[PDB]
Amino acid sequence: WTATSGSCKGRCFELQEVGPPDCRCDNLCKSYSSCCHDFDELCLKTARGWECTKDRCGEVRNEENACHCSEDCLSRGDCCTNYQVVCKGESHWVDDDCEEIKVPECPAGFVRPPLIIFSVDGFRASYMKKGSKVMPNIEKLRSCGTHAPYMRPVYPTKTFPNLYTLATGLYPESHGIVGNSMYDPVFDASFHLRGREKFNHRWWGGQPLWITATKQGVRAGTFFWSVSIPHERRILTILQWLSLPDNERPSVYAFYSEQPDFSGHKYGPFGPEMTNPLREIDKTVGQLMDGLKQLRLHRCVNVIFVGDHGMEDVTCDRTEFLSNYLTNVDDITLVPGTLGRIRAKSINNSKYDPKTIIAALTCKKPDQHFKPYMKQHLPKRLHYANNRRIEDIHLLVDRRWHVARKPLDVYKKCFFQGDHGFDNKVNSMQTVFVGYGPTFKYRTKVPPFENIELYNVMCDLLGLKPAPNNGTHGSLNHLLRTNTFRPTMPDEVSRPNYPGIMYLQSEFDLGCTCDDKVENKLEELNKRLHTKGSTKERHLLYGRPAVLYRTSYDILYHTDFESGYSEIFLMPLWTSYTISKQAEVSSIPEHLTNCVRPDVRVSPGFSQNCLAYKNDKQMSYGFLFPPYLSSSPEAKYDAFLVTNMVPMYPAFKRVWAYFQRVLVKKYASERNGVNVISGPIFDYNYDGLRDTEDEIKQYVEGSSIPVPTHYYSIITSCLDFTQPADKCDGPLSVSSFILPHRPDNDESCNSSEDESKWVEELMKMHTARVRDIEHLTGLDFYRKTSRSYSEILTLKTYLHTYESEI
Ligand SMILES: *[C@@H]1O[C@H](CO)[C@@H](O[C@@H]2O[C@H](CO)[C@@H](O[C@@H]3O[C@H](CO[C@H]4O[C@H](CO)[C@@H](O)[C@H](O[C@H]5O[C@H](CO)[C@@H](O)[C@H](O)[C@@H]5O[C@H]5O[C@H](CO)[C@@H](O)[C@H](O)[C@@H]5O)[C@@H]4O)[C@@H](O)[C@H](O[C@H]4O[C@H](CO)[C@@H](O)[C@H](O)[C@@H]4O[C@H]4O[C@H](CO)[C@@H](O)[C@H](O)[C@@H]4O)[C@@H]3O)[C@H](O)[C@H]2NC(C)=O)[C@H](O)[C@H]1NC(C)=O
Ligand SMILES: Cn1c(COc2ccc(S(C)(=O)=O)cc2C(C)(C)C)n[nH]c1=O
Ligand SMILES: [Ca+2]
């Protein structure tokens, strides 16, 4: 119930929410069906439109008008945004030369530069160049402020998950808005675009920027705008709030546009109908900047122009139907479109079986345009699994396609020509970032970055402490002139042991064999040096990784590689080695095919054993430092130490052996040497975070040897590839991956072919940031470089996409 009989007189767009059943005059009242009777009359004036004209200049104030051109309008804070241009001979902001804003130039009473977040829905990154001729205001912001060539959204590349990730710094699995449609089995409740359930607070996790500001005494304007309130009125409302007395005035404001997404769905991303929406968004930017210039705030406010996701060409005829795959299509519920989520239609149906659904959807048609995954098997870079609202079965849909349950859903539910939601590495899904103002840099281009990083920067711009989030604070310091965040490196929690030779060969009973009893003061002293770390500077180029949790581990040195060996997990946490451009690849000698050697530095009790692998009929083993890249026949024997061995399903060893034998040297050739750090990851509860020993669900049969869920590699070289990786004087270049450790290659439909046709494609799909490996391992990399810490944090957030140029 709402007693809509109270009044909005002098309450229009009030900032406080008055409690039911008293009628509301705040922006959300429309959405709630609760505005006072006179809200439209008083608060949504439209008389005479939005622009001053010569005849209106100096007019007698008529309170009916949408905006004013009377002499008193500046002191009332309610002139039309073009007032000073039309009536007072001023220029539009866009027509002014850009001039560096070295310090905030703010009216008296302003405690800090206000922040205005101008969000545009479906604004694809390439509109900035492709539409530049028709967006002069946006082009001025872009060229004069700080901009990236694109900003990476989160998956799924849908509106609500991205807008709320921008507001919170969290992945959707953590903030809870995992789609624009969701079912929460604990609540037994459904969230939809239409309707009221979506306003219930239990959907919205984390702490969004307006709540962060409010808790810390910084006032915020509205972020959600009722769809019926025209953009011109939204802008006028922000400018009115900016004229409030100091103690009442917000410091952070948001404007939202439903365009160009609305038209992009109808016309496609580059439909000729798209020019007009771009022009109209640019005109709204110009209204805002003219309005700020009138208020003498145009060199005071920081403005962020940011999008939620892009837009791809998608038509009704490019739809895959699950009814062409599944016999039981009526026993499932599908969340459809540019991603699929499948769960049982009835929880009482005990014939429902996810395994048979996955198999029926796997590589069943030659040009199949989606791929099924259990959510824990999705690429870890999507961070899309740890939430009960994400169904166990996920379909990753190819760009330009949809998936639906049955044909009748697509015509009895072509209209549309655009859509979005695909993998957030896809070029068409990328979106925009420009920052303009005193706190941003001037005429500065920054590399692409992920939208999860922006919350921390928005908090920096407002003087706020961010709530805990998934940004890496400091990684975007290069966007900023002032207010940078100067992080310290985390403290190492566990110090390593450095064991020497402590065990005789006969103390081991591992069931291993090696043909190595093949026998010198020249060479003997030299090999002793290698075991004490004499080549460590060659192979550990950026310092040893720090272990950020409590554990027991040993540093082991070798001619060709260094490792941090866990006594708890019986294998390395990390193995580091450098491969120069000149390195040669060799084979494993015949006499050494099954060789595994006890490591006399590490007790039998803290070693793996060969018998466990013999007995586990499903599990084989591989090596972290590859025997193929040994520096000499004699150094090769180190690669067969039991302390370099890790458990590997035979199907995965196909992938691993091709990476080690072919791709590492290919990368060293291309990049002028590479440093590689490789290791295991254990994430059995798919939370993106290192498992403790009691979370491990699978061991090599009969043993305490844990089976990794993934294997990672971090591959680093010099950004200036004229310099070799091991003699690099400037910035670094990195690429990394987190490969799932699976017992089949069902993910790769072409896996019956030679590894040259499918393995690198797999690895590209599982590209990762170093930060993702840090969360998964409790390790901190790049501790000893010559580079600034913020530059290293930017490096650790980098993701190599193998997408073509934007
Ligand atoms: C991205 O950044 C985020 C933010 O930094 C990282 O997420 C944090 O990760 C922590 C570890 O996973 C997690 O810490 C837990 O907090 C518990 C208290 O949780 C509530 O309070 C906080 C603080 O206000 C709140 O934010 C939480 O919000 C979640 O929950 C509601 C839903 O109920 C949602 O609305 C919201 O979206 C959010 O959901 C997300 O997180 C939860 C987990 O909290 C997931 O389940 C969801 O799927 C979703 O992803 C909560 O309201 C605290 O109780 C936990 O403590 C247990 O574990 C510790 C380990 O230290 C142990 O010592 C304790 O004994 C305790 O165990 C007991 O409970 C167990 C479970 O019943 C039981 O098994 C035991 O036997 C014990 O009885 C834990 O400390 C933190 O909450 C989240 N924060 C957020 C916002 O998500 C995230 O990891 C980063 N991602 C990456 C990849 O780096
Ligand atoms: C989608 N949407 C809106 C605008 O909603 C937002 C606009 C901007 C920002 S942020 C944080 O990017 O500045 C967040 C939001 C959420 C949805 C979080 C409240 N109004 N109406 C409507 O349908
Ligand atoms: Ca959107």
Ligand SMILES: [Ca+2]
């Ligand atoms: Ca985990």
Ligand code: NA
């Ligand atoms: Na075996």
Ligand code: NA
């Ligand atoms: Na296959």
Ligand SMILES: [Zn+2]
């Ligand atoms: Zn859309």
